[PDB]
Design a protein around this ligand. Structure first.
Ligand SMILES: CN(C)C(=O)c1cc2cnc(N[C@H]3CC[C@H](N)CC3)nc2n1C1CCCC1
Lengths: 252, 308
């Protein structure tokens, strides 16, 4: 179904992590930690933002089936990034992913010998974990990201380079900070990303000649009652993240 | 270790019946669903020397077979696990093109041959419009169901293409390989599969491949002995090729396309379409859209459903 990897607010409440004792707020912190580890490793492994975003969407869907208690975020993410890299045309070598994932999680520890018994186990553990990720996702590996719909929508509102970059910023951080990717379609999230970016930059797209708003031309199911509702949820958790809003704040 | 797996049922849900794949083309099984009896085909994802976890090529094949849902392309039901090893679950098409051609008991009428090439060109058109190259066009990869529906199969060597590309040159079997690949072209596209489509169309009347080369030089010589020598007047700007100065090939050949295939092919429109399919120049080779509009599929006898 097209309703397989999309959930309701009651579905997300009864997540598999909830059934093992993880609080609703404790689980969002676990997802945010994994995305930061995926971005940290991805920035070190020199993969595109698309690859990282695919591994994050894998992680978001992976814990809709599995629990954070049985699978820690520090273990699944290096295996999810290794899988997303191979799928997204930027394959990273297995011994390279473990190299970067080590100094990311253990900056002080030294990497064990490549011929040691412990190193050969985590090499097996990542492959085992990648196989479980594939099995968990049902081998559904194609991911649609809001970045494809943001560029297609900022072009037709004649937004400047600045506002289009801010809408792109809202997209990367919606995958880091919210479960929007588990409830709303990429065309809907892209509308939420552009709406908050416009509210942030005091940019106001006027109504077209047909009395139609700009979001109707992207997705008919998008309403202003929904846009303000989701841009409010995204903005709250953005206000909680340190140094995140400083990157898009106008100091002039 | 006994993991929760809702969206990946165990391959034990099917009951194996007989092997349909030996040696090079992996190990394939004809299977039967243990409840509905639906006939399927299972292919174990081979884990030979995969020091990089799950094979990147198995990822590419699975991703392609999930995008391509068409009446003339094989259907990926699902991907199953074991009690880790991975199986590909296909719908079972009983017959293949090569098996029917090499069987003297099987006979094709001109009307049925029109239907086979129309389903193959429609399948190639669908996969080309979906930005997918097959890169393994041959008679053994073309299957026909017991209902008479032709299916394109074996998308392992298949890759996506976009619009200076750097693609893989060691693709397609030697007997079905286009002249671009033999000359070492790494920027190729859809017409490489349409070249193999012409080698299949002629194979319908000859019951055997037409250019059975042994080496890469012997294949390029066989191509020139049938489709004329590789001339810059026939192939505008064939000059830039690395192997164009190092070819060592025949130079005074003239297109034996319609002459040598004249005995087996009786229809005038069929020979005219084969001539345009086996064109030396990729930019002048007929494509999937024009070939389906060719007068071969619109003159008597018209295409008919398959029964023999
Ligand atoms: C990559 N794979 C596994 C496929 O694309 C695929 C899906 C198939 C669905 N049904 C069949 N059935 C017959 C097997 C025996 C043959 N003589 C006639 C066809 N083969 C399929 N194949 C392969 C395996 C054999 C070569 C075609």
């Amino acid at each position: 179904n097209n309703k397989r990897w999309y959930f309701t607010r009651e579905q997300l409440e009864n997540s598999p992590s909830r059934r093992f004792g993880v609080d609703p707020d404790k689980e969002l912190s676990y997802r945010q930690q994994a995305a930061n580890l995926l971005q940290d490793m991805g920035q070190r492994l020199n993969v595109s933002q698309l690859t990282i975003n695919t591994a994050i969407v894998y992680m978001h869907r992976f814990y809709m089936i599995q629990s954070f208690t049985r699978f820690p975020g520090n273990s699944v993410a290096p295996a999810a990034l290794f899988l997303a890299a191979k799928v997204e045309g930027q394959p990273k070598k297995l011994e390279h992913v473990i190299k970067v994932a080590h100094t990311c999680l253990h900056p002080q520890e030294s990497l064990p010998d490549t011929r040691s018994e412990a190193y050969l186990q985590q090499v097996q553990d990542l492959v085992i974990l990648e196989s479980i990720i594939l099995q968990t996702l049902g081998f559904e590996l194609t991911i649609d990201h809001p970045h494809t719909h943001v560029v297609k929508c900022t072009q037709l509102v004649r937004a400047s380079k600045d506002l289009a970059q801010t809408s792109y910023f809202m997209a990367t951080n919606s995958l880091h900070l919210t479960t929007f990717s588990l409830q709303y379609t990429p065309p809907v999230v892209a509308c939420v990303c552009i709406h908050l970016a416009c509210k942030w930059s005091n940019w106001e797209i006027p109504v077209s000649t047909d009395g139609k708003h700009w979001w109707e031309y992207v997705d008919a199911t998008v309403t202003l009652e929904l846009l303000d509702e989701l841009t409010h949820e995204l903005l709250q958790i953005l206000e909680k993240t340190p140094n995140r809003l400083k990157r898009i704040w106008n100091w002039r | 270790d006994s993991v929760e797996c809702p969206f990946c049922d165990e391959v034990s849900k099917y009951e194996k019946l007989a092997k349909i794949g030996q040696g090079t083309f992996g190990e394939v099984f004809k299977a039967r669903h243990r409840k509905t009896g639906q006939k399927v085909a299972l292919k174990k994802v081979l884990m030979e020397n995969e020091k990089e976890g799950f094979p990147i090529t198995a990822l590419r094949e699975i991703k392609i077979l999930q995008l391509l849902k068409h009446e003339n392309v094989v259907n990926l039901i699902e991907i199953c696990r074991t009690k880790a090893s991975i199986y590909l679950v296909f719908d079972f098409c009983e017959h293949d093109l090569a098996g029917l051609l090499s069987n003297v008991l099987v006979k094709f009428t001109l009307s049925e041959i029109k239907r086979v090439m129309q389903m193959l060109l429609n399948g190639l058109y669908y996969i080309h419009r979906n930005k997918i190259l097959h890169r393994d066009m041959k008679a053994a990869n073309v299957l026909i169901t017991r209902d008479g529906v032709l299916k394109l199969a074996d998308f392992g060597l298949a890759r996506a293409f976009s619009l200076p590309n750097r693609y893989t040159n060691r693709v397609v079997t030697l007997w079905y390989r286009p002249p671009e690949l033999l000359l070492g072209e790494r920027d190729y596209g859809p017409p490489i599969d349409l070249w193999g489509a012409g080698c299949i169309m002629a194979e319908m009347w000859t019951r055997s491949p037409i250019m059975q080369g042994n080496t890469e030089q012997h294949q390029l010589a066989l191509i020139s002995q049938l489709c004329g020598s590789i001339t810059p007047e026939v192939w505008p700007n064939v000059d830039n090729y690395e192997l164009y100065e190092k070819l060592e090939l025949v130079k005074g050949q003239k297109r034996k396309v319609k002459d040598r295939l004249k005995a087996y092919v009786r229809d005038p429109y069929a020979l005219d379409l084969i001539d345009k399919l086996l064109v030396l120049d990729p930019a002048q080779r007929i494509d999937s859209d024009d070939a389906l509009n060719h007068d071969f599929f619109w003159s008597d006898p018209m295409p008919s459903d398959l029964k023999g």
